[PDB]
Structure formats: C-alpha cells, structure tokens
C-alpha cells in the first residue's frame, strides 16, 4: 500500500538554506504559535555571535545581527521568550570589567526591533516572567539581591538583599527564601520563607527552618528540618502558605531526598529515596488534599540527587504512566500503570517477535523501553518516548524484547491504542516526529555516515516510503517542528561534508500537496478507549467513566488542519469499593480491599480517589 507521484510533489516543496559562518553551537527558539517566527543564535569562540530570524516557518532566514549591534551574547542563560502570544524576547550581553551593571536587548514585537538598556545590577539568573502579566520580571544579582521590574525591564527596584531562591506564584505573588548568617550553603536548613503580594511593598513570613521549597500546581511544598534531629519532613499548604499541614510521608535523613515526578491539580507523584546508595527509591501518590499519601511502587529507579529517572507520563491516553524498576540482580525492567498508579504490570509482548538472550523462557518474555537512564549510560538511544496530547493513543519509543533492558542496538516500537499492544515499526535507531495531529509521521536514520533520505508514513507507522531530499548527503544533527504537533513543515538540520571547511545547513519540507484533501465526516471512526473485554458491563471504565473518541482512519489520507480538536463522549459508571482510598487513621489489610483502623484534624471512613467521577452504588462515608 503506497501512494504514487509523491516524488514531484515533495520535490517542489523543499527549501535549502546555508549559513555562512564558523561552526560553533546553535540555539533554536519558537516565538509564539501560529506566527512561524524562529530565532537562531549562532555563537563561536573569542566572543562572537550571529542572530538569524525566519518569519516563514524556517524556509528562509534573515541576518538581524546588526539589530543587537554586534555584541557577544551570554548563551548560559539562553533566550527568554515571553509566555503565550506576546512576542517578548530578552537577551543578555557580556560587559567589560568596569561595568556598573549588565546589559539587555529587549523586544516586544516578535523580534522585529530591539532596544538596548543598562541594568543597575549584574543578573546571575535568567529573567522570569509573571504568568498572569508578561510586563513583570524578576532576577537575582551577583550579590544575591532581588530586583523586580514592573514595566518590562525599563526600571528595576531592589526588594531584598539575601535571597537564596525566588519564583513567581499565582496572581503576581512572589515566594523567596532568605538567609542571615553565612552564605546560602553553610546556612542550609535554617532559612526563612517570605511572601509578598504587592511586588515587594509589604512582606510576610510564612515559614522558618526551611530546607527547600517549590510549587507543584495548586500546592506549596516546603521541606522543614526537625527541631532536634537532622531528619526533615514535608509540609504542604494550599492557601499561599497562610496555613500549613503536615503530610503523611516518612521523614528522610540527611543522605536522602524527595522528588516530584508529576503534579496535577489533584494528584502529585512523590519519590522518596531509601537510605543508602543502593540506587532505588519508592513512589507515593497523594489525594485531592495533597496530604495523605499511599505507597504505589517499590524499587523505583533514580540514579542520584541530580540523576535521571525513567518516569514518563503518556499524554496520548488518560491515566497511563511508564517507569523503570530495579530487580534483585540490578537488572532494570519496565512497568506500566493504567489506573493513575493503582496497579503496575509488564508491557505486553509484541505478538510477532522473538525473545532475545536475556529471556530464559523463549516462549515468555516482555517488552522493555529505553529512556533517560539508557541515554545516560551512552547507548544507541537517539530519542526518548514520544507522544502528543492531540494524537490519540499513539506512543513511539526504542525498546528490546526480553527479561531485562539489553545493551544491543535497539529497534523502534509503536502502539496505537495507548500502550496495551505494541509492534515493531522500524529496525535500528531513528529520529521520529509526529505532524498534523498524527496525520503523517516522519523518521530519520541514526548513522555515523552522511544521509540523504527521509521516511514518512500516513497510516500510523504501517506503510513507509523513502524520499531523497538532497543530492549531497549531510551529517544529521536533529529535527525541528512547531510545538504542539499541528504543523506540516519539518526542518532537518546538520552540516555538510566539506572537509576543508564545514558549514551548517537546513532543509524544510512542506507536506501540503501530500495531504491534498481535507478530512470529512466519513473519514472518522468511533473508538472506545481502555477497552479490554467487551463482555464487561462497564468495559473500559477507568476512574468511574468511559470515553468514546472519533479517530481518523489509517486508510483515509486527508489533513486534519490547524483547527482540529478531538471529540469525546464520557459516560459515568457505578461506584465500587475500589474507587476509595484510606484516610489518616486507617489502612488496607493484605488480601482484602476494605480499609480497617490502624492499631489535630480527624477523619471518618474512606476517601474518594482524586480524578474519580463515579456516582451511585457503594458509598462507605
């Protein structure tokens, strides 16, 4: 199954741009959505920078380096793109040794024109925008001062002098911590937490003896040292710190740490490292209040305090997560949960693959997925798992079949129903991407030699076709596309083979003439999610309700468009004893589902799991 006469259609829609400059490093930023503005910041070493801007989704670039008047730019901070569609860009330059303060070039019209200003300080961290109003900024100077600007960098005012860390809250509220004696390092565990809703006109103290703090959605977390030991607990507040309540989590020591893996408006995933350097921890899941925590998974993988973990939220399907556990022999394995952490199991084996050497039972093995950790160990894993919210039930990732993550060269596997079933898509490492909300997928081979071919499929990784886009192969470096997976333009970077003097290059391909027609009512089928056993009266009812999507058929070759929005039709299910969790003074006996009592606020009975929308039936207070 293949379409014909696509070679000419793709040939007409191909644009090459070559950058004449020394090969240093590159940085790519997208300014807004639906504008097609791309800013490329080239740097080389001494100090020298070049700035390019494209207003056509990357088909053509212009040299606007003279706007910033040929001044070296600090790439450590990076470009500070404004939130949403505001087109605010701020750059930080390098100043001489006798400078009073730093210097920034600021634009508010999608980088059409830049304005130069001199700061009264030396910013030591990237500028931060207020989510509710982009005109506000804050930064920390080298002397740990806190400077806040209310007119987009025109003027700044110092509102404190010993700030360790700061960050915008909600509704233009600022939370920051301060120290008194010594630096912020030697004074750890004896800090204070401050809040100010008037942009530093009136302050307030909301905590003491703090060890760290952070924002996890509609929660405020602060790790407080114990009064007489080195053990530190977790305190959580949801009133902007007005009132705090102790969380029901173990008190870790000084050699351990916490870590938020994913924080919604209702649930939060917490990781608690076990004592010792064994290299694993545990996962707890909270309730709607963010106070009561129940154990979810054990022997979770976490390299170190600054290390990496394989936890992954599958955005395509509701309540699906994937993570790596640690076995008894230190052999990593992959687990998946569909109940938002209720149960974990192995990934289903592909129905048409053979187990590798890692599997002792040649008729019994499972699929395992490479992730951040595998990339850390320097394996052949060009990319991590990919998934888009607007492409329903699609997941792509490298993996191997067996009883443990192997070290051989991995293949690529794809699932088109959320993760229940998989199948081998390509052989060998690749760089993959999704365009037009799952309309067309593209892939580039991962090789050590120049490549001049790109593959693409229109039936969700079923039929693949090869297009030769360049006559001169280039060393591939990466793919770029508009965030959100709703465009049809794809940019292919790299650098030419020129041995005497190499150069950068980019090829942009537009698939407007491949998807000639626009999808209609007929080009859609009704699909039920989480369906396992049709016999069930409430088949595929997760967290109390079902959902019936309308998904584009694989055979249908058509364009969803930029205005496509997924369709759904939820229906609730009767409640049961499995929709509730335990309260402070109760626990689940083993081999049963009831919540009995264990051998200040008070609780009576059970609690309804966050995200659950069932109604009717069993209701144990």
């Amino acid at each position: 199954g293949r379409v014909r006469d696509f070679v000419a259609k793709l040939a007409n829609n191909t644009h090459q741009h070559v950058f004449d400059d020394l090969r240093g490093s590159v940085s790519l930023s997208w300014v807004g959505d639906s504008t097609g503005v791309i800013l490329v910041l080239t740097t080389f070493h001494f100090g020298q920078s070049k700035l390019y801007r494209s207003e056509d989704y990357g088909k053509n670039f212009k040299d606007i380096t003279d706007l910033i008047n040929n001044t070296f730019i600090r790439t450590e901070f990076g470009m500070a793109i404004g939130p949403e569609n505001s087109g605010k860009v701020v750059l930080t330059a390098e100043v001489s040794g006798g400078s009073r303060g730093g210097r920034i070039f600021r634009s508010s019209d999608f980088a059409k024109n830049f304005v130069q200003t001199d700061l009264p300080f030396h910013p030591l961290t990237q500028m931060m925008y207020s989510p509710q109003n982009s005109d506000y900024l804050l930064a920390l100077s080298t002397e740990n001062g806190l400077w806040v600007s209310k007119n987009f960098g025109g003027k700044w005012e110092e509102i404190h002098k010993a700030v360790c860390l700061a960050k915008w809250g909600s509704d233009n509220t600022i939370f920051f911590t301060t120290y008194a004696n010594g630096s912020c390092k030697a004074d750890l565990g004896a800090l204070e937490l401050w809040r100010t809703s008037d942009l530093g006109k009136s302050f307030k103290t909301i905590g003491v003896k703090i060890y760290s703090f952070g924002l996890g959605g509609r929660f405020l977390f602060a790790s407080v040292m114990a009064d007489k030991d080195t053990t530190r607990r977790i305190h959580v507040s949801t009133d902007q710190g007005d009132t705090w309540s102790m969380a029901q989590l173990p008190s870790v020591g000084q050699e351990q740490f916490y870590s938020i893996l994913a924080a919604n408006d209702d649930m939060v995933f917490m990781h608690v490292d076990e004592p010792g350097d064994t290299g694993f921890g545990t996962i707890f899941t909270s309730d709607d209040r963010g106070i009561v925590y129940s154990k979810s998974l054990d022997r979770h993988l976490y390299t170190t305090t600054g290390g990496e973990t394989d936890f992954t939220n599958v955005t395509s399907l509701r309540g699906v997560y994937i993570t790596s556990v640690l076995s008894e022999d230190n052999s990593i394995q992959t687990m998946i949960t569909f109940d938002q952490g209720g149960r974990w199991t192995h990934l289903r084996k592909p129905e048409n693959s053979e187990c590798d050497a890692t599997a002792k039972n040649k008729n019994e093995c499972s699929l395992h997925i490479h992730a951040s950790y595998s990339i850390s160990q320097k394996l052949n894993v060009p990319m991590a798992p990919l998934s888009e919210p607007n492409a329903v039930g699609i997941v792509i990732a490298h993996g191997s079949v067996g009883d443990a993550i192997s070290v051989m060269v991995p293949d690529v596997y794809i699932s088109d129903d959320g993760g229940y079933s998989w199948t081998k898509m390509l052989e060998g490492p690749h760089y993959y991407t999704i365009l037009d909300s799952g309309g067309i997928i593209v892939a580039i081979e991962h090789s050590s030699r120049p490549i001049n071919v790109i593959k693409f499929s229109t039936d969700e990784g079923q039929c693949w076709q090869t297009y030769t886009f360049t006559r001169d192969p280039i060393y591939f470096t990466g793919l770029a596309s508009e965030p959100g997976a709703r465009s049809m333009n794809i940019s292919i970077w790299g650098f030419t083979e020129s041995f005497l003097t190499s150069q950068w290059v980019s090829y942009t391909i537009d698939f407007k003439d491949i998807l000639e027609r626009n999808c209609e009512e007929k080009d859609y089928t009704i699909w039920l999610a989480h369906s396992t056993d049709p016999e069930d009266y409430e088949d595929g009812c997760i967290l109390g309700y079902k959902e019936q999507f309308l998904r584009l058929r694989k055979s249908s070759v058509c364009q969803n468009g930029r205005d496509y929005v997924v369709t759904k039709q939820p229906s609730i299910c009767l409640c049961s004893l499995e929709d509730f969790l335990c309260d402070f003074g109760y626990y689940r006996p083993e081999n049963d589902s009831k919540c009995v009592e264990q051998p200040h606020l008070t609780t009576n009975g059970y609690r309804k799991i966050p995200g659950d929308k069932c109604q009717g039936g069993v209701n144990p207070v």
């Binding site: 952070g214 996890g216 740490f257």
Partner: peptide, 15 residues
C-alpha cells in the same frame, strides 16, 4: 537538595 518543582524544558541546542 530536593526537587520539589517541575523543571520545564529549555531550548533545542546543537553543535
């Protein structure tokens, strides 16, 4: 240290 806040992505970089 404790990672109590989600770290959003950065910027695409090459070399």
């Amino acid at each position: 240290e404790d990672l109590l806040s989600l770290q959003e992505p950065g910027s695409k970089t090459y070399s």
